[PDB]
Structures are given as structure tokens and as C-alpha cells.
Design a binder for these strands. Structure first.
Ligand SMILES: [K+]
Ligand SMILES: [K+]
Ligand SMILES: [K+]
Ligand SMILES: [K+]
Ligand SMILES: [Mg+2]
Ligand SMILES: [Mg+2]
Ligand SMILES: [Mg+2]
Ligand SMILES: [Mg+2]
Ligand SMILES: [Mg+2]
Ligand SMILES: [Mg+2]
Ligand SMILES: [Mg+2]
Ligand SMILES: [Mg+2]
Ligand SMILES: [Mg+2]
Ligand SMILES: [Mg+2]
Ligand SMILES: [Mg+2]
Ligand code: NA
Ligand code: NA
Lengths: 61, 130, 183, 71, 141
RNA sequence: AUUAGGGUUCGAUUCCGGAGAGGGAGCCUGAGAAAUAGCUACCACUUCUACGGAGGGCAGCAGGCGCGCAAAUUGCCCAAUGUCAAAACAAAACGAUGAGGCAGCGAAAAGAAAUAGAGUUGUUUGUCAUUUCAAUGGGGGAUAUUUAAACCCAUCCAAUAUCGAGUAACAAUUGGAGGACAAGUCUGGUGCCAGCACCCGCGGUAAUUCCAGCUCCAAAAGCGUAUAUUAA
């Protein structure tokens, strides 16, 4: 069957452990709404015929 | 802008009422203290209200339930003043009299008096409480 | 146990949680009007729905119906006094076309900014939150205070606030104590 | 009501036929109710006749009405 | 086609009464055969004791082994098979331990490729199986 | 509760009506009871005893054990509301009240709302590194207010004289990022395994779905999951 009860947690262990990097706090409450709003409508401009990619990633493979 | 001024209090009465039933005059008193660090104590209002309505003694003035306005500078509360001090001693509750200073001593624990009754009911007469 | 006071609700979540058109439109109302979350908008939506539903009922009855004549006249007074509807718009059909931005236009946080008191709508909210504004010489500490038209000329700084007839604020007070102690 | 049965002694059974309205379906349905009524020897009604009855005190286990007319 | 008479309400009432029993959702909510067969007895959750660990071969086209346990409830004493909602959680649960069980989300219906499993383990030893998995809380003994 | 309308569903639960006081059944008194913090008997349980005998009925309040997926303190007080009473209050002279009121615990649920507001310089706007500026609350207290007394809220930081925010560390979480459904050509391993996945599906060595970081998304002092129910 190629699977077994003894194989449990295999990938959990396989995955090597990596720590989380440190980070400063972000604004909370009305500040976050007004901080994101300036990114949505003020930090950039809308060009007709082009859609805004809300979280684009660097190229790779 | 802002200037240093002496703290002042203004006294106004609303819905003045006269009743002979308890020998007292009842009204609602509003307090205007624009520059007052805190809230006006009732002892001061008693002297101002005694002076305003020209009663021989301040201790016949009963003021209670003074609730303050939001934002500050104003406090309102109910108050009745009696024709004589003796009538005030006769017609006043124990908690209000104690607040002035004439209230009777506080009764013992109600749990004890409750327990004391149930001990007695199990015994014959003259053997209950000695 | 035998407690007898109502506690109703004032808002409702949207039926479709993820609409790009609705999320972007609501985010525009947040920054443009300075709201902490979307519940203020949903409170406004429920406020506007209720006037719309009762108006819808009133227009079905004849104009001589006593219920229409009384409740129709009342809802006009509620719209005009709170500034929701323009005073020359006297018909009952103009209540139907009321809009969400009209309701937030009458919020104190909006009116404070629009009167020149607050340079920004976010300045207005915190300024109201800091007991700095009095309407008809009564301190208001609540951004969602819908103001009447007849009380618009009475908007000012509170006489207790540092900006006005009141004592100095915290910073001018704590630092002064520091200098006196250092003596 | 209408005299339904005269098989007892000094007593008759009457039927009160009516229509009951079902609100959901917006329609009526035929319903009937039976009553035991005391009939005096002054009347002598027959099956299918029409009578007027009036409420009195309990006269028996089931009788609470008395015949007043026969039509 | 149906009746349309003004005084035909009795027929229309019986028509709906007889034909409501063809609604599987309505019939299930108005009969006791579903509650008598339901191990939880009409409740959301139920505690139990672990008997043994079993691996269920997932349905086609999936090919895996799903960690599962045989559990006996304490209010009915009936055999069920539950599921451990993450990986490396079969080691955390040990035989003869108190597990709080819940439904799989489909109201008495098998979920996913697990063949005959309608329940999932939510708690172990009065501690959440999620917090135990997240290395956030520790189980006693 | 939900609902365009018609409807569907819930109602042990605060007001009204009924019933019961472990299960049954009888009865005295009384205007009124088939009364149960009244009596009598039997069945189940039960406690004290000097063994002769005598006691018990929390589906009242407060509180235990079991049952369970599952639910507060053996707290204060008659100050309000009422009940009874031989009875206004007062004066040697102050009635009872676990009814009730007021607090403790309490993320069932509901309303208002924090976590910051502006700048000068450099890097049409806009981000970032600076320089600062004023303000309020959380909180600490009081001449004191509230309150039967308290606690809470409201007032104030001297009126001659009243403390405090810069990483304003007084540091916001819960699920997700193939589709439904807002959000990634980033990962890295496993290699139809470990797993995810409400449904469709992902995983067989360059994983769209697995197990993490960043970013981003959605809601936000709230957010998942299970089971019912209403709409759909
Ligand atoms: K309600
Ligand atoms: K007789
Ligand atoms: K009742
Ligand atoms: K991921
Ligand atoms: Mg009912
Ligand atoms: Mg029941
Ligand atoms: Mg009874
Ligand atoms: Mg019992
Ligand atoms: Mg009895
Ligand atoms: Mg009892
Ligand atoms: Mg008994
Ligand atoms: Mg109890
Ligand atoms: Mg990869
Ligand atoms: Mg779901
Ligand atoms: Mg439905
Ligand atoms: Na597969
Ligand atoms: Na398979």
C-alpha cells in the first residue's frame, strides 16, 4: 500500500526548522485604514487598461 | 485666553414646591461652578442655600442626589429644606440624618439577628435570650 | 432575571463577504471620511435602510391618508432638521434618493473638518475624542454626533479645553512641573 | 342549528355547520359541531328541521342549551 | 396540476402534509430514526475513550494513509472512528485517553477521501489538539 | 429569529394562566389548601442515638456529588419596590423579608469607542530617514460626588496650593493567498508518502493546495470550528 501507521509525522520532521525574522510594529486601528488608503488611492495612480497587481513577487524559475 | 479667577458657585432652583404635610419646602437645585477643581461638596451648597432662602440655620437644609453634568461646570440635585430643625430630626431617614450628623447608631449584623431568632424558636419561654 | 431594558442592533454584515467593487468602495469611504473600521459604514447603511423602508410604505398610501399625512410630515422634519435633505425638496419622494455620503456629511467629525476647525478629517476625530469641541456649550466626545442645521453655528472649542478659555493642556503642564522640581 | 337526531327522550342533537378559513391557503373548509340540546314537549321537531337554542345551566353531562324555536 | 376551489382548503392541507414527507431534510428533522442512529445523540460534541489506532486507505484517485482511531463514547458506549486534523498528531493521542470529538462538517456525512469517517478529534486530555500540534500547550502525563 | 410578499421556525425561561414539591394516596384547621420550609400512612432512599428510641424532603437563595458538549458567590442590605402585620414618623421607642434591590464571577448577546494628531530639511506628488510641536485617555489620586454603606460611572489635576505617553514596548489577534472568494512566476523538503482539501481538487523529484519567512488579503477586540435553525 506504500503507507503505514509508523510513517506519521514524516514531512513534519523532514521540513528543517527556520526562525522568524524580527519586525517592528505596524499601526493599529484607524491608522491602518488610513495608511492602506493612501497606498490604495494616493501612493500611485490608476492607468486605464491596466490592472493593479496587489502583491507581485520577484521573478524566479 | 485663560486668566486666574477665584472659584465661584451659582445656585438656582427649579420647580419650587410648598407642602404642609412634612413641614418642608422642596425644589431642585442646579450648581454653576465654571472654575472649580473637582465637584462642589454639599456642605458649601448648604451654606449658600441657607443664605439664599434666609433660614436661621444651615442644618435644616437637606441636600442629596447631586449628579454632575457631563463636560464639567455644572451639577444638579434635589433638595428640601424644613421649616424647623426639630421637624428635620423628626422627618428624616437614618442615612440622610447620619450624613448630616444626627443619624442613629447602626444596628448589629442582620445575620446575627436572623440566627438569634432560630435559636430561640427551638426553646421554651424564658430560656430564650435570658 | 427580571431585567427590562432593550438592547437592539444597529448594523449588519454584507451578504457577499468578498466583493472587489464593494471592498474598494468601502475603503474609499474609510480614508475619505476617517473611520476606524467598516462597522460605521454598516451602521450608516442600516440607518439609511430604515428610512427607505418606511418611506417606501408611505408612498403607497394616498396623500390624504392620516398615517401618510402624519408620518410623512414627521419624516420630513427629521430629514430637514438633521440636514439630510435640502429644505426646498419638500416632496416625500426625495427621501427615497438619500445616499450614504449624505449621512456621513452630517457627522461631527465631518462637520468639524469642513468648518475649518480641523485641517484633516483624522484631526477632527482625535480632536473630538480629546474633549476639545463643545456643541451649544456642551462637550461632545463622539465622532458620530449627527448635528442639526440649527446647531451648526454653535460649533466651537470647549471653554475648558486648552485651545480657548480653559487651563493649559498636558504638555504645557507636565514640563512646567519638571522645571519647578529641578529648582 | 339544524336538528340532526331525535332518538333520545326530550333531547335532540343539532349540527352547527360552518366554514373555517385557512389563512395560508386563502381558502375555506367545511366544518361542523354537534350539540346536545333539551327539547320541551311543546315543540316536537323532526330531523332536518331548524331550531333556535339558548344557553342554560348544565342540565346533564352534555346538555347546556334549550330549544327556543322550531322552524 | 392541483385543486383551485374556494372551499378546497382541506384538500390542499392534506396535499402538503402527505408530500412534505418526500423532503429528505424535512423527514429527517421530523423523525427519530436519525437521532437514534446518531452516536452523538443530537449534540455537537461528545467525549470518548480511545481503543486502537487504525490507518484508512484514502479513496481513489488519492493514495495515502489517514491516521484514525477507534473511539467509544461515554454517554452511549458506541464504536466510532474519528480523524486527527493535522500531521504528527497520532503520536500525541494515546490509547485510553479522554478525547472530545466533533462532527466533520457535513452533518453526519463522510468528508473528503476518508471512506467511513464522520467525526474528528478536537480535544485530548482536556487540551485542544490544535494547541498540542502548534507546540503551544502540553498534554499532561 | 428570519423574511419583498406569502411564509418557515423557536417559545423550559422574567408578564399572564395551569401544575408539582422524591413517588402515590388521605386529612385537620381555616373564608380560602387535598397545603407539603402542615399532619397521617405505604414504597424507595436516607441521619442521630445512651439501641429504649427519635428524625428528612433545596424543581427557594447561597453552595456540594454525579450527569453531561454544557451553565456564577455559602457576598452586602431592607436604602428603593412591594408583602404581611396589633402597625405613619419621631421620642429608653430603629418590625420581618435569600421576595427584592445593590456588588463579585460572567468574550451568551447588545450600544459608544483606544492603539495616536500635525509639521521644517533631505531623500507635482507620494515612501523613507530627521528635527520637533502641542493633546487626550488608560492609569495615580482627591475639597470631595455617587451610594443604606460601598464599588462603578460623572468632576478636577488647585480655587493661594493637586501626577503622569515616544520604540507614545501603555508592543492586535484569527483564518487564508488555484476556483467558488479578497490576496504571491518567493518558498524548501517529501515524491500519490507526510499531509491539505466543507465542494472541485493538490501531492508519483522544478507541489498551484503539504509542512515555514516576507508580503498581501479579509474581519477586527474580536476571529475560527461543530451541531441545530431561518434565508438562499
Ligand atoms: K428584541
Ligand atoms: K336532578
Ligand atoms: K408562572
Ligand atoms: K504557504
Ligand atoms: Mg409557550
Ligand atoms: Mg424538558
Ligand atoms: Mg400545589
Ligand atoms: Mg429532588
Ligand atoms: Mg401534599
Ligand atoms: Mg424546601
Ligand atoms: Mg414525603
Ligand atoms: Mg439552589
Ligand atoms: Mg516548491
Ligand atoms: Mg465553512
Ligand atoms: Mg431554510
Ligand atoms: Na491524486
Ligand atoms: Na487509492
Amino acid at each position: 500500500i506504500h503507507g503505514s501507521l509508523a510513517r506519521a509525522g514524516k514531512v513534519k520532521n523532514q521540513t528543517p526548522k527556520v526562525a522568524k525574522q524580527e519586525k517592528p510594529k505596524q499601526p493599529r486601528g484607524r491608522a491602518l485604514k488610513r495608511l492602506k488608503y493612501t497606498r490604495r488611492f494616493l501612493s500611485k495612480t490608476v492607468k486605464p487598461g491596466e490592472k493593479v497587481h496587489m502583491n507581485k513577487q520577484p521573478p524566479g524559475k | 485666553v485663560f486668566q486666574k479667577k477665584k472659584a465661584e458657585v451659582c445656585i438656582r432652583t427649579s420647580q419650587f414646591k410648598v407642602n404642609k404635610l412634612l413641614n418642608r419646602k422642596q425644589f431642585i437645585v442646579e450648581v454653576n461652578h465654571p472654575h472649580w477643581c473637582g465637584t462642589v461638596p454639599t456642605q458649601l451648597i448648604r451654606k449658600k442655600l441657607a443664605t439664599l432662602y434666609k433660614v436661621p440655620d444651615a442644618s435644616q437644609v437637606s441636600l442629596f442626589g447631586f449628579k454632575t453634568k457631563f463636560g464639567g461646570g455644572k451639577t444638579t440635585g434635589f433638595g428640601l429644606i424644613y421649616d424647623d430643625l426639630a421637624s428635620l430630626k423628626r422627618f428624616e431617614p437614618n442615612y440622610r440624618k447620619t450624613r448630616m450628623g444626627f443619624g442613629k447608631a447602626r444596628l448589629p449584623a442582620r445575620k446575627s439577628v436572623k440566627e438569634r431568632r432560630n435559636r430561640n424558636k427551638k426553646l421554651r419561654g424564658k430560656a430564650k435570650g435570658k | 432575571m427580571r431585567n427590562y431594558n432593550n438592547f437592539n442592533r444597529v448594523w449588519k454584515a454584507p451578504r457577499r463577504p468578498f466583493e472587489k467593487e464593494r471592498l474598494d468602495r468601502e475603503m474609499k469611504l474609510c480614508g475619505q471620511y476617517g473611520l476606524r473600521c467598516k462597522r460605521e459604514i454598516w451602521r450608516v447603511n442600516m440607518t439609511l435602510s430604515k428610512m427607505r423602508r418606511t418611506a417606501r410604505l408611505l408612498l403607497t398610501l394616498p396623500e390624504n391618508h392620516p398615517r401618510r399625512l402624519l408620518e410623512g410630515s414627521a419624516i420630513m422634519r427629521r430629514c430637514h432638521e438633521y440636514g439630510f435633505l435640502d429644505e426646498e425638496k419638500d416632496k416625500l419622494d426625495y427621501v427615497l434618493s438619500l445616499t450614504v455620503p449624505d449621512i456621513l456629511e452630517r457627522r461631527l467629525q465631518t462637520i468639524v473638518f469642513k468648518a475649518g476647525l480641523a485641517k484633516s478629517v483624522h484631526h477632527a476625530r482625535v480632536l473630538i475624542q480629546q474633549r476639545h469641541i463643545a456643541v451649544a456649550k456642551q462637550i461632545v466626545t463622539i465622532p458620530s454626533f449627527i448635528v442639526r442645521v440649527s446647531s451648526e453655528r454653535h460649533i466651537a472649542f470647549a471653554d475648558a479645553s486648552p485651545f480657548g478659555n480653559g487651563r493649559t493642556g498636558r504638555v504645557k503642564r507636565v514640563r512646567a512641573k519638571a522645571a519647578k522640581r529641578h529648582a | 342549528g339544524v336538528v340532526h337526531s331525535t332518538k333520545m327522550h326530550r333531547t335532540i342533537i343539532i349540527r352547527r355547520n360552518y366554514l373555517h378559513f385557512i389563512k395560508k391557503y386563502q381558502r375555506y373548509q367545511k366544518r361542523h359541531k354537534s350539540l346536545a340540546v333539551h327539547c320541551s314537549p311543546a315543540f316536537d321537531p323532526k330531523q332536518g328541521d331548524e331550531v333556535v337554542i339558548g344557553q342554560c345551566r348544565p342540565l346533564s353531562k352534555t346538555i347546556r342549551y334549550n330549544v327556543l324555536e322550531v322552524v | 396540476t392541483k385543486t383551485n376551489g374556494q372551499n378546497a382548503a382541506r384538500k390542499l392541507v392534506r396535499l402538503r402534509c402527505r408530500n412534505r414527507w418526500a423532503d429528505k431534510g424535512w423527514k429527517r428533522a421530523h423523525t427519530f430514526s436519525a437521532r437514534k442512529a446518531n452516536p452523538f445523540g443530537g449534540s455537537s460534541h461528545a467525549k470518548g475513550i480511545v481503543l486502537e489506532k487504525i490507518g484508512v486507505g484514502a479513496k481513489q484517485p488519492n493514495s495515502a494513509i489517514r491516521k484514525c482511531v477507534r473511539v467509544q463514547l461515554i454517554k452511549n458506549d458506541k464504536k466510532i472512528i474519528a480523524f486527527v486534523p493535522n500531521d504528527g498528531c497520532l503520536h500525541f493521542i494515546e490509547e485510553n485517553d479522554e478525547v472530545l470529538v466533533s462532527g466533520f462538517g457535513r452533518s453526519g456525512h463522510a468528508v473528503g477521501d476518508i471512506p467511513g469517517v464522520r467525526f474528528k478529534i478536537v480535544k485530548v486530555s482536556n487540551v485542544g489538539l490544535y494547541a498540542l500540534y502548534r507546540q503551544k500547550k502540553e498534554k499532561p502525563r
